[PDB]
């Protein structure tokens, strides 16, 4: 058995392993999410598609349950482990209490795992950041965000990855109860919020929307293509 | 400059710097004083001034009906040791339906404290103690050390600046046996007054007093229960 | 032992007797067979008294911890599931139980029956014990969903009274509770002897 | 970089960790032992640091069994650990085989235990050496001495401590093979008082013990009358 | 002890994993392997690294390792780790078949292996496997497929990939000669031969420096067949002819 | 270089000395004990106007008579909070009565220092915690307020302040406090000092406040009552 | 109780220098030679004792594993003994399960798996030895070679130990595919003779053969006749 | 033990002023065969504690070994404290209970006598963990045949002398020999006083009168 | 091998306005013979709590030792002594912990509450307990219960005003009840202990019954 302290304190009370994990998550592809009136949407950037892949196998937007979905930035191999553990937890909760989970319940579970890997012997921290969205039985949309340290908040709209430093300033100024009225209004909002960070031009973006019905619907390339023309 | 990190490395002079440092930890604390007469043993401690608003501390704890201790050093380690001593006395009374001799208790404590000092990736308990008890053979004032060896003494003081209390103690040890309880306690409070700097005298809430004896269980004296003892120290 | 419970228009009604026996000797004559789990839940006691009491105390503790963690109360379905799961770990070791959980949630009146075997079923009228077959004959013939509170009270009292009149392991007093939207209340603790003169001449 | 572990030979085939645990003993106060026809006699110069302690604290003579004594030198905590191990070894032997353990067997068992701590990086060697001694109608008196490395030899008189050099030199001029315990005890008192330094250390305590035929094979402590007389004789001899 | 520990599973001051970065450079110098997907099946085509005259060709292949009745792979990097991985893949496929009484899908196989590859980078103190894999297969849902894993533990579906040595230029020239949807198996073989002919520093191929396998469906059955030296020689002759004719 | 357990030439335990420095980088909290109850108050320290302020919970409830306010590593504090809740529920289950603030502080302080990297446990801690706590509540002796450190030393206070501005917050608390307060003047002064030391503007959504008193349970202030109090001040 | 971290790690260029160093150790052993003929294999070693005091009969370098397999080595003898013991155990387990003699290829695969396990576990070094396996099953002779890393090959004629480069450079020329076992022995002996620095004797070398009837090492009385030519 | 094999019979006990006297016969029965005829069923624990046991003999020997090692080990460091009759009575009760709770009991009915601090001790410890004190004891068939005479005497006079207690003990041993079919005509007699424990060799009840 | 024995004994508690009373007999038995004639069953727990036990004597002894240890652990951890309700709850949990090989005891806790009045708690071997006003367990409980029903409960009789139980009348009732129980049950009758838990402290008395 391997029992060593990998992440330990430092002069001035820093955790260098966690700081390095965050410096790593600061290099992924940008993700953006907003919370609508009756809809929730996410959006991820594709650095390059390479003209030879199969996009069905490199998707960064999964579905943990009927009403919960997520999108990450960082390291895909770690993201996969976290996602599968969250799926098993959702099934256990359904089995024991006879009701689908809340968004905050699964956010707490994920954050607890991430924190546990910062204080155990013989482990390094996870190198991913997640954005979790969904609806509940009340009919209230939610949007959260976790960190490699185990801390999570609730936000109106947020952006993770590289270029988030400008996506956040853009979204701060432009977010208002007017761009929220309708789905084809919020979706164009998200698209123009992502486009000024995509310096390639055009659509190198994946965009998934989730409404109270027809869950985790994913916009087709042609459909997403139409919106870009409308903006211009 | 490579022998001062692990507890399992000897120096070219046959010393263990880690055990040393763990002792220099014990010197940081506030002074204590113990002593015994023909029929009673006594502990007196000086609760340190933490801040302008907080209740001072707990420096004297019950171990059993006849045993009590007083600590100086890491309080977490101190109460970790106190739990072990309490379980020892409880186990004794369960099996033999009688109390425990203070000497056998201190033997168990030393044997337990020694093991960490030898293995890799472990550190010594950073706390010194002062035990007081009554038994068939009379009082006892044992003292322990971070390095697991313990002593037996008529009167001993541990803590910062306790050199003066130790000098006073030996200089006046000639009469501790015959002296009465009131006389015995005052001898303790004077000795404890010695270590304080010039700007402070014993008040009524920065001192504690423990007492065990022939026909009397171990008792601790509260903030204003120590008033009948500090009335004469002119 | 005789316990009953039936949902109706205005919530749930619960009743019981109070005698406990070891063989043919009546040890106690006023036990409490309704177990107040919290201000908003309640169970009932039939089978082994020690098993009943112990496991419903465990359940009360877990409901409190659920509330503290999730900032919301548990529901009747979830509480029944927790109890059934807890006792399924000791199947075949000799536990003796059989209980009823009643309460109100966002879905209205709830009435569940959990056993030592491991079953749980939703219903509109249950009855447990060794006078259960005597109480059924009166509940089935008097019950109606279009009934109000005092008619329900009278029907429950009459069922328990005739059950303890014909059964040897039932007697003493009858304790009546009532689950409404705003928690439960205690209605009456009349004694079967002072009921019998009322119910005849 | 070869001084930090008991798993590293020096380029010349040495183990400096054991060499340092030996210095730990090579600067501790002296204890001697003397074998005789009738029995054995232990003697230790016990140091009194300050007046405050009661006389009787920090004893260096233990009772490992009802016929085995033991004198120690070095770290007293390690010494007490070893004494418990030895008590454990003797009790198990009696429960297995139904009679008392031979000193030759006990010393072999304890030396193996000590040597097991000289091979690994997870532990450190003990820092104390000690002497044993018994008496049996079968084999008579005996005397052994174990080192921090785990070597155990038989002796006629041993001088573990700091004044080993001066102690051994004076004990060799003794003719112990013909004396008796009553006649040896005085000699132990005298030689310890001679080897004792009275400058660095000002005050010292003296305790003695013996196991022989006069005690019927039981290890004891020398009675108080014999001790006082021995001290007087030593003082007279010293001048 | 802490003095001798090498700390294989920690982050770098910039968020990197140095042991994985070094295993990737190990895999950088291995023998060239390449795969190509088509309408009627997939194909692998590796390069023979040990060409000594005194060797023996007892095995039906050197870097193929049929894993199941429907799949097969190929490796680059360290043979000793490759053997462990291949044994593990076979065991996973048989456990799936035992539980469900149906063959396993290719994505599930690749996933179950990449989990094991990832668990070697997060805890344990060991070093990671220095091996990259390519897979080919056929299942009920998606038909002919072609994947690729790497030491870190992340995979991805492709249509024409390449690992090993000079894989950069291999993929560069693959991008300009592959047309989605219209490629048949024969045009696939032609492109594979003509890419291998260049991305190998030698003057020209030898029909024994290469190793070629295909995969097809025939009569409701999967057939995995390693091509023969004469077939390869004929293909090389065909490549020699047409290329010569153009100029 | 070193291990986690390693004394210094002053016998200081380097790792604990660093975990203590990890607290001078948190947001200030304040507790105050009265003869009529206790009050807790903590700055929320919002980052950007897009973050929901109802999602920063730094004052939790341990039981119907005990509450807690933390500072430091909010990710670390959650295991302590959970274990305190579980211990209180166990005590109720076994003895049919409510625990005491002293007992809860003492049981929580016994998890500190329980770390190491060899022969510790199957799954054990690898470093000390980085959270300081503040307990408040009422029991069979009245309102009480305790304080906990990462070293494991717990004291009993009547007006304590923890955080990154405490060396300035106590310099005012020692002048303001007296043994004849009421909870209302306590609340007023606890708000005045916060306003004194904070960087933003003390309005009704970037602070938090709760109170326990001998009559009622643990109760949190509302954005109605809180606003009225702030406006009234 | 033991270290849990690896002692073999990757370098900035992707090498494993502990394995490279175990190979450098192997390159300093005694010469070994194997040659596969039309109806058998031949292993021939240099068993050169330090002085005349050493009793030659006590220790052997050519050992059997089953009734049809035998092997030799180059590198470190104390490691070779561990490998021999585990190979014997592996063969016995296979026979216990299948009631059939194990084939040479399965034997080599299991041995190389063990040698690979010693490159990635905690607190150990790799073996400092390479092997040369011999066998005969289903009417065919086999000859493999195993490396310290865990990679095995298959040859027609190879050479290990010191001067292996010139050994195989000379071995390539003479080798014929129609060679009989008795005429292959001459070439094996001659190859050893190229780099011996001394005079050949019936106790300077060891020789084992394997054909249809099983494995056996020749006796000095027979090595004498073979050396006479 | 599941099934006892070689068993002893009744042990007696009386306490007089300044001492305690106990007695037992020397016989091991192999289920109605008098197999061994010179075994000692009485132990001396230390200078103030005696012990006699009934039932299985191998269990008695095991407990002898254990108790002896305990007394030795506590006497080793000789710090001035020693075990007492009461401490040994408690230790024995605890060990018997711990064995019965695992369903693997020791099959004896021990009796502890002692004299410390200036007053006597006499205790009883059954195999199930039942334990008490009394001024007289008897195990086995003695509980029916000898306890009535002891109680008849101690009713009138609450205190006896050493001589009277010894006379009473032998007068009861005679009747045990008359009426018990597992009894023998050779017994030992131990006695603890302020000077220590004394055991007396093979005595006989030759005071028989068979007038048939 | 049966790990249980039946040893007799009767216990009886009665709660009043200011007081509380536990009583018991002093005979120990096994089968048809008498072990001792002076063995109590009432144990003082704290200055305001007494507990009476009945059933199997080995379990009674073990249980009282465990309870005495846990009171001290609680006091050392909480800086105050336990209360009667906390003691009853803890006893419930202790009895349930051994539920597949249980203590064969019938416990009867008595004491004063924080508001200064009697509190009788009855227990069954596996944990079930309830606060009563009087209770009787043991070998003559079916003989004692109807008499207490008629006297303290005042049942089945009209033409009476039912004024509370003074200490005098309570003690007289306890004495007469035990005399009549001794005249008909073969397991009671050596002597009678009476513990009185009151504000000042616990008192005890003794009365003789008729011998066998």
Burial D138-171 (b: 16+ CB within 10 A, else e): eebbbbbbbbbbbebeeeebbbbbbbbebbeebb
Q: Which two tokens stand for residue F16?
A: 């604990």
D77 touches chain B (CB under 8 A): yes
Q: Give the long-range contacts of residues A141-145, CB within 8 A, separation 24 or more.
A: A141/A35, A141/A36, A141/A38, A141/A39, A141/A40, A142/A35, A142/A40, A142/A103, A142/A104, A143/A33, A143/A34, A143/A35, A143/A40, A144/A103, A144/A104, A144/A107
| CA–CA separation, F8 and B21 (whole Å) | 6
H128 touches chain I (CB under 8 A): yes
Closest partner CB to B5 (pick from F6, F151, F160): F6
DSSP D3-16: SS-TT---TTS--H
Beta bridge partners of G44: G33, G207
* Nearest Cα residue to F85 out of I80, A118, C75, C61: C61
- In the numeric block, the tokens 């059954």 are attached to H126
| CA–CA separation, D72 and D80 (whole Å) | 9
Nearest CA in chain B to I63: B94
What is the third-level CATH fold of I1-212? 3.60.20
- In the numeric block, the tokens 């174990």 are attached to D146
* Nearest Cα residue to I13 out of I53, I61, I55: I53
For residue I3, how many other CB atoms are within 10 A of its CB?
16
The DSSP code for C191 is B
Q: Is E142:E82 a contact under the CB 8 Å cutoff? A: no
| CA–CA separation, C104 and E10 (whole Å) | 53
Positive or negative, the CA dihedral D27, D28, D30, D31 is negative
| CA–CA separation, F28 and F206 (whole Å) | 12
Chain H partners of B98 at a C-beta cutoff of 8 Å? 84, 86-87
- CB atoms G155 and E6 under 8 Å: no
* Nearest Cα residue to G65 out of G96, G116, G104, G29: G104
Residue boundaries of the structural domains of chain G: 1-229
Nearest CA in chain I to C94: I100
Burial I147-177 (b: 16+ CB within 10 A, else e): ebeebbeeeeeeeeeeeebeeeebbebbbeb
End-to-end CA distance of chain G: 58
Domains and CATH numbers, chain B: 1-234 (3.60.20.10)
Q: Is A18:A147 a contact under the CB 8 Å cutoff? A: no
Q: Is D217:D67 a contact under the CB 8 Å cutoff? A: yes
Q: Among C59, C66, C70, C121, pick the best mutation site for testing chain A contact (most A Cβ within 10 A).
A: C70
| CA–CA separation, B227 and I97 (whole Å) | 48
| CA–CA separation, A122 and E124 (whole Å) | 7
**H or E element in which residue F201 lies:** none
CA B232 vs CA B172, B205, E169: distances in Å: 18, 16, 99
| CA–CA separation, D186 and B157 (whole Å) | 39
Q: Is G142:G43 a contact under the CB 8 Å cutoff? A: no
For residue B119, how many other CB atoms are within 10 A of its CB?
14
Residue B201 neighbours by CB under 8 Å, 6+ apart = B193
The DSSP code for G71 is E
**H or E element in which residue G114 lies:** helix G104-117
* φ/ψ of residue E94, rounded to 5: -70, -35
| CA–CA separation, G7 and D53 (whole Å) | 54
Q: Which two tokens stand for residue G32?
A: 């070994």
| CA–CA separation, F44 and F27 (whole Å) | 7
Q: Is H128:H106 a contact under the CB 8 Å cutoff? A: no
The DSSP code for G69 is -
| CA–CA separation, E122 and E140 (whole Å) | 35
So what's the architecture of F1-233 in CATH?
Answer: 4-Layer Sandwich (3.60)
Nearest CA in chain I to F99: I78
Q: Is D235:D84 a contact under the CB 8 Å cutoff? A: no
| CA–CA separation, G35 and G134 (whole Å) | 10
Chain F partners of I83 at a C-beta cutoff of 8 Å? 97
Closest partner CB to I90 (pick from F94, F100, F106): F94
Chains with ≥3 CB–CB distances under 8 Å to C: A, F, I
Closest partner CB to I33 (pick from H100, H124, H143): H143
Q: Among I92, I106, I130, pick the best mutation site for testing chain C contact (most C Cβ within 10 A).
A: I130
For residue F47, how many other CB atoms are within 10 A of its CB?
9
Residue boundaries of the structural domains of chain I: 1-212
| CA–CA separation, A121 and A119 (whole Å) | 7
| CA–CA separation, A53 and E156 (whole Å) | 8
Q: Which two tokens stand for residue G26?
A: 């192997």
* Nearest Cα residue to C49 out of I153, I122, I64, I11: I122
- In the numeric block, the tokens 């089945």 are attached to I156
- CB atoms H86 and B97 under 8 Å: yes
Expressed in Å, this structure's resolution amounts to 2.7
| CA–CA separation, I127 and I96 (whole Å) | 5
Q: Which two tokens stand for residue D133?
A: 């001694």
Q: Is I64:I53 a contact under the CB 8 Å cutoff? A: yes
- CB atoms F61 and C64 under 8 Å: no
Instruction: Flag whether C touches D (3+ CB pairs, 8 A cutoff).
Output: no
Q: Counting runs of H as helices and runs of E as strands, what totals does chain F give?
A: 6, 11
Residue boundaries of the structural domains of chain E: 18-246
Q: Which two tokens stand for residue E54?
A: 């005194």
Instruction: Flag whether I touches D (3+ CB pairs, 8 A cutoff).
Output: no
B80 touches chain I (CB under 8 A): no
Antiparallel, parallel or unpaired: β C183-188 and H19-25? unpaired
Chain F partners of B74 at a C-beta cutoff of 8 Å? 113, 151
Q: Among C63, C68, C70, C71, pick the best mutation site for testing chain F contact (most F Cβ within 10 A).
A: C68
CATH number for the domain harbouring residue C13: 3.60.20.10
Q: State the Cα angle at E86 between E80 and E92, rounded to 5°.
A: 145
Question: What is the Cβ-side half-sphere exposure of residue B145, based on CA atoms within 13 angstroms?
Answer: 15
Chain E partners of G5 at a C-beta cutoff of 8 Å? 4-8, 125-126
Q: Is E109:E125 a contact under the CB 8 Å cutoff? A: no
* φ/ψ of residue H131, rounded to 5: -150, 135
Positive or negative, the CA dihedral D184, D190, D195, D198 is positive
Q: Is I30:H132 a contact under the CB 8 Å cutoff? A: no
Residue H177 neighbours by CB under 8 Å, 6+ apart = H183, H184, H185, H205, H208
Closest partner CB to E11 (pick from A21, A51, A54): A21
* Nearest Cα residue to F76 out of F111, F49, F51: F111
Distance of CA A176 to the CA centre of its chain: 22
Residue boundaries of the structural domains of chain H: 1-212
What is the third-level CATH fold of A1-232? 3.60.20
* φ/ψ of residue C195, rounded to 5: -85, -35
Shortest Cα distance, chain E CAs vs residue A182, angstroms? 36
Nearest CA in chain E to A23: E15
Q: Is E81:E131 a contact under the CB 8 Å cutoff? A: yes
Q: Which residues of C are annotated as a binding site?
A: 49
**H or E element in which residue D64 lies:** strand D61-65
H207 labelled catalytic: no
Which technique? cryo-EM
Residue boundaries of the structural domains of chain A: 1-232
* Nearest Cα residue to G126 out of A204, A149, E127: E127
Distance of CA D239 to the CA centre of its chain: 28
Q: Which two tokens stand for residue E60?
A: 């039906």
Q: Is H196:H48 a contact under the CB 8 Å cutoff? A: yes
G113 touches chain E (CB under 8 A): yes
Beta bridge partners of E46: E33, E211
| CA–CA separation, A177 and A173 (whole Å) | 12
| CA–CA separation, G192 and G198 (whole Å) | 11
Task: Tell the burial category of I35 from Cβ atoms under 10 Å away from its Cβ (0-12, 13-18, 19+).
Answer: buried
- CB atoms F5 and B18 under 8 Å: no
Q: Is H55:H8 a contact under the CB 8 Å cutoff? A: yes
Residue boundaries of the structural domains of chain F: 1-233
Beta bridge partners of F207: F43
| CA–CA separation, H156 and E123 (whole Å) | 84
* Domain E18-246 coded CATH 3.40.50.720: no
Q: Which two tokens stand for residue H87?
A: 């401490």
* Nearest Cα residue to G145 out of G91, G187, G186, G105: G105
Hey, is E25 helix, strand or coil? helix
Q: Which of the four CATH numbers 3.40.630.30, 1.25.40.340, 3.60.20.10, 1.10.150.120 does domain H1-212 have?
A: 3.60.20.10
| CA–CA separation, D215 and D104 (whole Å) | 21
Chains with ≥3 CB–CB distances under 8 Å to G: A, E
Domains and CATH numbers, chain D: 1-239 (3.60.20.10)
Closest partner CB to H128 (pick from I3, I35, I36): I3
The DSSP code for C72 is S
3-state helix, strand, coil in chain A (%, to 5): 35, 20, 40
Task: Tell the burial category of D48 from Cβ atoms under 10 Å away from its Cβ (0-12, 13-18, 19+).
Answer: middle
Shortest Cα distance, chain C CAs vs residue I126, angstroms? 6
Query: Helices (DSSP H) in chain C: which residue ranges?
Result: 49-70, 76-88, 132-142, 149-166, 192-196
| CA–CA separation, C101 and C124 (whole Å) | 12
The CATH code of the domain at G1-229 is 3.60.20.10
Distance of CA H9 to the CA centre of its chain: 10
- CB atoms C78 and A105 under 8 Å: no
Nearest CA in chain B to D80: B111
Hey, is B212 helix, strand or coil? strand
Angle subtended by helix axes B75-96 and I57-78, to nearest 10: 160
Q: Is B73 left (phi over 0), alpha (psi -120 to 50) or beta?
A: left
Antiparallel, parallel or unpaired: β D40-47 and D31-35? antiparallel
| CA–CA separation, A206 and A53 (whole Å) | 15
């Amino acid at each position: 058995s391997y029992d060593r302290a990998i992440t330990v304190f430092s002069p001035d009370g820093h955790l260098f392993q966690v700081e390095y994990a965050q410096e790593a998550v600061k290099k992924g592809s940008t993700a953006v999410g907003v919370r609508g009136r009756d809809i929730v949407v996410l959006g991820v950037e594709k650095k390059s598609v390479a003209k030879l892949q199969d996009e069905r196998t490199v998707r960064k937007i999964c579905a943990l349950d009927d009403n919960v979905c997520m999108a990450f930035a960082g390291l895909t191999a770690d993201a996969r482990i976290v996602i599968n553990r969250a799926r098993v937890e959702c099934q256990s909760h359904r089995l024991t209490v006879g009701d689908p989970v809340t968004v905050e319940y699964i956010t707490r579970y994920i954050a607890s795992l991430k924190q546990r890997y910062t204080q155990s012997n013989g482990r390094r921290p996870f190198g991913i950041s997640a954005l979790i969205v969904g609806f509940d039985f009340d009919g209230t949309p939610r949007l959260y965000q976790t960190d490699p340290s185990g801390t999570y908040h609730a936000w109106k709209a947020n952006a993770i990855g590289r270029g988030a430093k400008s996506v956040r300033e853009f979204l701060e100024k432009n977010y208002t109860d007017d761009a929220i009225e309708t789905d084809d209004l919020t979706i164009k909002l998200v698209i123009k919020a992502l486009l000024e960070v995509v310096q390639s031009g055009g659509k190198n973006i994946e965009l998934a929307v989730m409404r109270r019905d027809q869950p985790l619907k994913i916009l087709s390339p042609e459909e997403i293509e139409k919106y870009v023309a409308e903006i211009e | 400059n490579q022998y001062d990190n692990d507890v399992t490395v000897w120096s070219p002079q046959g010393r263990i710097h880690q055990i040393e440092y763990a002792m220099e930890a014990v010197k940081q604390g506030s002074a204590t004083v113990g002593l015994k007469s023909k029929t009673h043993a006594v502990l007196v401690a000086l609760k340190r001034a933490q801040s302008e608003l907080a209740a001072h501390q707990k420096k004297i704890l019950h171990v059993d009906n006849h045993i009590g201790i007083s600590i100086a050093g890491l309080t977490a380690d101190a109460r970790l040791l106190c739990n072990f001593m309490r379980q020892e006395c409880l186990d004794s009374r369960f099996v033999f339906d009688r109390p425990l001799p203070v000497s056998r208790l201190v033997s168990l404590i030393g044997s337990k404290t020694q093991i960490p000092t030898q293995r890799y990736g472990r550190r010594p308990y950073g706390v010194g103690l002062l035990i007081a008890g009554y038994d068939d053979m009379g009082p006892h004032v044992f003292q322990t050390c971070p390095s697991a060896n313990y002593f037996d003494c008529r009167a001993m003081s541990i803590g910062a600046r306790s050199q003066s209390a130790r000098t006073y103690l030996e200089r006046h040890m000639s009469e501790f046996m015959q002296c009465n309880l009131d006389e015995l306690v005052k001898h303790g409070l004077r000795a404890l007054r010695e270590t304080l700097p010039a700007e402070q005298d014993l008040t009524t809430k920065n001192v504690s007093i423990g007492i065990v004896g022939k026909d009397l269980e171990f008792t601790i004296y509260d903030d204003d229960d120590v008033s009948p003892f500090l009335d004469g120290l002119e | 032992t005789t316990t009953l419970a039936f949902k109706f228009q205005h919530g749930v009604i619960v009743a019981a007797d109070s005698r406990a026996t070891a063989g043919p000797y009546i040890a106690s004559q006023t036990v409490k067979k309704v177990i107040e789990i919290n201000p908003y839940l309640l169970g009932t006691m039939a089978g082994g008294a020690a098993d009943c009491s112990f496991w419903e105390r465990l359940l009360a503790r877990q409901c409190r911890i659920y509330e503290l963690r999730n900032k919301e109360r548990i529901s009747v379905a979830a509480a029944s599931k927790l109890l059934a799961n807890m006792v399924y770990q000791y199947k075949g070791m000799g536990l003796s139980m059989g209980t009823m959980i009643c309460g109100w949630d966002k879905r209205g009146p709830g009435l569940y029956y959990v056993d030592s075997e491991g079953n749980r079923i939703s219903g509109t009228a249950f009855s447990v014990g060794s006078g259960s077959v005597y109480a059924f004959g009166v509940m089935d013939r008097g019950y109606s969903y279009d009934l109000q509170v005092e008619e329900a009270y009278d029907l429950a009292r009459r069922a328990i009274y005739q059950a303890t009149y014909r059964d040897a392991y039932s007697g003493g007093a009858v304790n009546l509770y009532h689950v409404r939207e705003d928690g439960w209340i205690r209605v009456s603790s009349d004694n079967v002897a002072d009921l019998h003169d009322k119910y005849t001449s | 970089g070869y001084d930090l572990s008991a798993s590293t030979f020096s380029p010349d085939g040495r183990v400096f960790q054991v060499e340092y645990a030996m210095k730990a003993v090579e600067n501790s106060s002296t204890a001697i032992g003397i074998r005789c026809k009738d029995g054995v006699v232990f003697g230790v110069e016990k140091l009194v640091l300050s007046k405050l302690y009661e006389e009787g604290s920090n004893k260096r003579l233990f009772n490992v069994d009802r016929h085995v004594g033991m004198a120690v030198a070095g770290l007293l905590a390690d010494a007490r650990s070893l004494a418990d191990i030895a008590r454990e070894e003797a009790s198990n032997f009696r429960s297995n085989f139904g009679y008392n353990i031979p000193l030759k067997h006990l010393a072999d068992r304890v030396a193996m235990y000590v040597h097991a701590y000289t091979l690994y990086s997870a532990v450190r060697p003990f820092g104390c050496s000690f002497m044993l001694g018994s008496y049996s109608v079968n084999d008579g008196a005996q005397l052994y001495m174990i080192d921090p490395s785990g070597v155990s030899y038989g002796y006629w008189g041993c001088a573990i401590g700091k004044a080993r050099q001066a102690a051994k030199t004076e004990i060799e001029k003794l003719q112990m093979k013909e004396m008796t315990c009553r006649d040896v005890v005085k000699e132990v008192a005298k030689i310890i008082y001679i080897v004792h330094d009275e400058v660095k250390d000002k005050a010292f305590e003296l305790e003695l013990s013996w196991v022989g035929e006069l005690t019927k094979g039981r290890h004891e402590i020398v009675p108080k009358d014999v001790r006082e007389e021995a001290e007087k004789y030593a003082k007279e001899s010293l001048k | 002890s802490r003095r001798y520990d090498s700390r294989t599973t920690i982050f770098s001051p910039e968020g990197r994993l140095y042991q994985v970065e070094y295993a990737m450079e190990a895999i950088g110098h291995a023998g060239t392997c390449l795969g190509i997907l088509a309408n009627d099946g997939v194909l692998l085509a590796a390069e023979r690294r040990n060409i000594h005259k005194l060797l023996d060709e007892v095995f039906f292949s050197e870097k193929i390792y049929k894993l199941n009745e429907d799949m097969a792979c190929s490796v680059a990097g360290i043979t000793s780790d490759a053997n462990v991985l291949t044994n593990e893949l076979r065991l996973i496929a048989q456990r799936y078949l035992l539980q469900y009484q149906e063959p396993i899908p290719c994505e599930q196989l690749v996933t179950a292996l990449c989990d094991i590859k990832q668990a070697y980078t997060q805890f344990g103190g060991k070093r990671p496997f220095g091996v990259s894999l390519l897979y080919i297969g056929w299942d009920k849902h998606y038909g002919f497929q072609l994947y690729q894993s790497d030491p870190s533990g992340n995979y991805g579906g492709w249509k024409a990939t390449c690992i090993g040595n000079n894989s950069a230029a291999a993929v560069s020239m693959l991008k300009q000669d592959y047309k989605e949807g219209e490629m048949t198996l024969k045009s696939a073989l032609a492109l594979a031969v003509k890419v291998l002919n260049k991305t190998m520093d030698v003057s020209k191929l030898s029909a024994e420096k290469v190793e070629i396998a295909t995969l097809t469906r025939e009569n409701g059955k999967t057939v995995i067949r390693v091509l023969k030296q004469k077939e390869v020689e004929q293909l090389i002759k065909k490549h020699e002819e047409e290329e010569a004719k153009a100029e | 270089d070193r291990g986690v357990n390693t004394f210094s030439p002053e016998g200081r335990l380097f790792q604990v000395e660093y975990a203590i420095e990890g607290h001078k980088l948190g947001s200030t909290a304040i507790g105050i004990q009265t003869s009529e109850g206790v009050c807790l108050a903590v700055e929320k320290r919002i980052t950007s106007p897009l973050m929901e302020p109802s999602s920063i919970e730094k004052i939790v409830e341990i039981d119907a008579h005990i509450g807690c306010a933390m500072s430091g590593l909010i990710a670390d504090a959650k295991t302590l909070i959970d274990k305190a809740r579980v211990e209180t529920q166990n005590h109720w289950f076994t003895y049919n009565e409510t625990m005491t603030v002293e007992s809860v502080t003492q049981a929580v302080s016994n998890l500190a220092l329980q770390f190491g990297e060899e022969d510790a446990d199957p799954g054990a801690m690898s470093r000390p915690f980085g959270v300081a706590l503040l307990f408040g509540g009422v029991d069979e002796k009245g309102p009480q307020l305790f304080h906990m450190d990462p070293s494991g030393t717990f004291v009993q206070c009547d007006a304590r302040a923890i955080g990154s501005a405490s060396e300035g917050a106590q310099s005012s608390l020692q002048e303001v406090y007296h043994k004849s307060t009421t909870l209302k003047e306590a609340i007023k002064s606890s708000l005045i000092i916060l306003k004194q030391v904070m960087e933003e503007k003390l309005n009704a959504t970037n602070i938090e406040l709760a109170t326990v008193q001998p009559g009622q349970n643990f109760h949190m202030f509302t954005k109605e009552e809180l606003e009225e109090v702030i406006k009234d001040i | 109780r033991g270290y849990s971290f690896s002692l073999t790690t990757f370098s900035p260029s992707g090498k494993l220098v502990q394995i490279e160093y175990a190979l450098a150790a192997v390159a300093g052993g005694a010469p070994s030679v194997g040659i596969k003929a039309a109806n058998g294999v031949v292993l021939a070693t240099e068993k050169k004792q330090k002085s005349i005091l050493y009793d030659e009969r006590s220790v052997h370098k050519v050992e059997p594993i089953t009734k049809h397999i035998g092997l030799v080595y180059s590198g470190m003898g104390p490691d070779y003994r561990v490998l021999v013991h585990r190979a014997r155990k592996l063969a016995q387990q296979y026979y216990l399960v299948y009631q059939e003699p194990i084939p040479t290829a399965q034997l080599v695969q299991r041995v190389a798996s063990v040698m690979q396990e010693y490159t990635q576990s905690g607190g150990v070094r790799p073996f400092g030895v390479s092997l040369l396996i011999c066998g005969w099953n289903e009417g065919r002779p086999y000859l493999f070679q195993s490396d310290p890393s865990g990679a095995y090959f298959a040859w027609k004629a190879t050479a290990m130990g010191k001067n292996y480069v010139n050994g195989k450079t000379f071995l390539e020329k003479r080798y014929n595919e129609d060679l009989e076992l008795e005429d292959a022995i001459h070439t094996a002996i001659l190859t050893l003779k190229e780099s011996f620095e001394g005079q050949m004797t019936e106790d300077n070398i060891e020789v084992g053969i394997c054909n249809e009837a099983g494995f056996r090492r020749l006796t000095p009385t027979e090595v004498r006749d073979y050396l006479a030519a | 033990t599941q099934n006892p094999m070689v068993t002893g019979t009744s042990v007696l006990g009386v306490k007089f002023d300044c001492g305690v006297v106990i007695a037992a016969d020397m016989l091991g029965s192999y289920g109605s065969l008098a197999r061994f005829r010179n075994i000692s069923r009485i132990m001396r624990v230390n200078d103030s504690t005696m012990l006699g046991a009934s039932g299985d003999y191998a269990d008695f020997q095991y407990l002898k070994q254990v108790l002896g090692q305990m007394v030795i080990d506590e006497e080793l460091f000789g710090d001035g404290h020693s075990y007492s009759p009461r401490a040994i009575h408690s230790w024995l009760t605890r060990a018997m209970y711990s064995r019965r709770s695992k369903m693997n009991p020791l099959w004896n009915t021990k009796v502890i006598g002692g004299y410390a601090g200036g007053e006597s001790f006499l205790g009883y410890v059954d195999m199930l963990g039942v334990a008490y004190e009394a001024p007289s004891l008897a195990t086995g068939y003695g509980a029916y045949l000898a306890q009535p005479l002891l109680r008849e005497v101690l009713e009138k006079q609450p205190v006896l002398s050493q001589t009277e207690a010894r006379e009473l003990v032998e007068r009861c041993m005679r009747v045990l020999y008359y009426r018990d079919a597992r009894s023998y005509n050779r017994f030992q007699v131990a006695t603890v006083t302020e000077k220590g424990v004394e055991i007396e060799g093979p005595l006989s009840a030759q005071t028989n009168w068979d007038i048939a | 091998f049966s790990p249980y024995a039946f040893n007799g004994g009767t216990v009886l508690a009665i709660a009043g306005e200011d007081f509380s009373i536990v009583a018991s007999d002093t005979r120990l038995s096994e089968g048809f013979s008498i072990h001792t004639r002076d063995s109590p069953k009432c144990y003082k727990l704290t200055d305001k709590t007494v507990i009476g036990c009945s059933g199997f004597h080995g379990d009674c002894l073990t249980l009282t030792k465990i309870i005495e240890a846990r009171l001290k652990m609680y006091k050392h951890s909480n800086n105050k002594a336990m209360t009667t309700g906390a003691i009853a709850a803890m006893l419930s949990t202790i009895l349930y912990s051994r539920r597949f090989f249980p203590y064969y005891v019938y416990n009867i806790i008595e004491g004063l509450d924080e508001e200064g009045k009697g509190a009788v708690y009855s227990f069954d071997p596996v944990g079930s307990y309830q606060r009563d006003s009087f209770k009787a367990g043991g070998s003559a409980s079916a003989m004692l219960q109807p008499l207490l029903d008629n006297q303290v409960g005042f049942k089945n009789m009209q033409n009476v005003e039912h004024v509370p139980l003074t200490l005098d009348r309570a003690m007289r009732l306890v004495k007469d009840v035990f005399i009549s129980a001794a005249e008909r049950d073969v397991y009671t009758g050596d002597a009678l202990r009476i513990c009185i838990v009151t504000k000042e402290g616990i008192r005890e008395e003794t009365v003789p019954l008729r011998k066998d």
